[PDB]
Design a protein around this ligand. Structure first.
Ligand code: OQT
Ligand code: ZN
Length: 257
């Protein structure tokens, strides 16, 4: 199936998913000098007070912390968005080395990892229906650099040994995603896509300028995960990032400067 290697990684995805060569693919390099400050953008509103995490899950490509999105709870609005987008899950992409791992880049800089908080536009009723619309999803992307530990991340890291392998899940309740946010909500935004198959062109990307710091020990725990299932040869889950794709007609807008 698809994955991140030589014979099934990103340069192969187009054969099963021809939109991989589409007009609004993600991620992209954010050229900060070219991004246009847009004084009409609004502050983002990230309203995570009542978020209810349910499970954390390893799917063989990443791991994802899930939320109960059956009620008007943890919502993203404002910024570039029209309407209300409800948080459904977050996940990460990361590298084998601290010098790579992010999907987006900033003036060609790669971060050690990238957090994706995925939200769906409530006007489409479900995340699945939302994924068929060109304004269906909004992903808040946050870069991770290696330095001091992020305390709010540790509950996630400490459960990973219980989900080492593809298909494992754990009861993951009362996790507060506010502990994963940097101080500043300054951002870049552009229209793009899922970064994994099926690569749907359904995402408004909102990429925060300010990275969070995680410790070397925290990211080493991500790198102990496996892309295989239990009882299969160990494949470390590392380098699960799609490289930057052509910007094509698009303009990246800045909320700041
Ligand atoms: N970056 S991503 O393509 O993985 C992503 C998006 F860009 C997006 F807009 C919505 C998503 F749900 C996902 N990630 C999930 C895709 C399938 C299930 C799964 C399992 C674990 C981690 C993430 C995801
Ligand atoms: Zn992602």
């Amino acid at each position: 199936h698809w994955g991140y290697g030589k014979h099934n990684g990103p340069e192969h995805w187009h054969k099963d998913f021809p939109i991989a060569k589409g007009e609004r693919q993600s991620p992209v390099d954010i050229d900060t000098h070219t991004a246009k400050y847009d004084p009409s953008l609004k502050p983002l509103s990230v309203s995570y007070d009542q978020a209810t995490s349910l499970r954390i899950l390893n799917n063989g490509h990443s791991f994802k912390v899930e939320f109960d999105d059956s009620q008007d709870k943890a919502v993203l609005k404002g910024g570039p968005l029209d309407g209300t987008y409800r948080l459904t899950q977050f996940h990460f992409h990361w590298g084998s080395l601290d010098g790579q791992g992010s999907e987006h880049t900033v003036d060609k800089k790669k971060y050690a990892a990238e957090l994706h908080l995925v939200h769906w536009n409530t006007k489409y009723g479900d995340a699945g229906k939302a994924s068929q619309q060109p304004d269906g999803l909004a992903v808040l992307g946050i870069f991770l650099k290696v330095g001091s530990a992020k305390p709010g991340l540790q509950k996630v890291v400490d459960v990973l040994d219980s989900i080492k392998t593809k298909g494992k899940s754990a009861d993951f309740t009362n996790f507060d995603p506010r502990g994963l946010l940097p101080e500043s909500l300054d951002y870049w935004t552009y229209p793009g896509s899922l970064t994994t198959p099926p690569l749907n062109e359904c995402v408004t990307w909102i990429v925060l300028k300010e990275p969070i710091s995680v410790s070397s020990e925290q990211v080493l725990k991500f790198r102990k995960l496996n892309f295989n299932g239990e009882g299969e040869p160990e494949e470390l889950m590392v380098d699960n990032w799609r490289p930057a794709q052509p910007l094509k007609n698009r303009q990246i807008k800045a909320s700041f400067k």
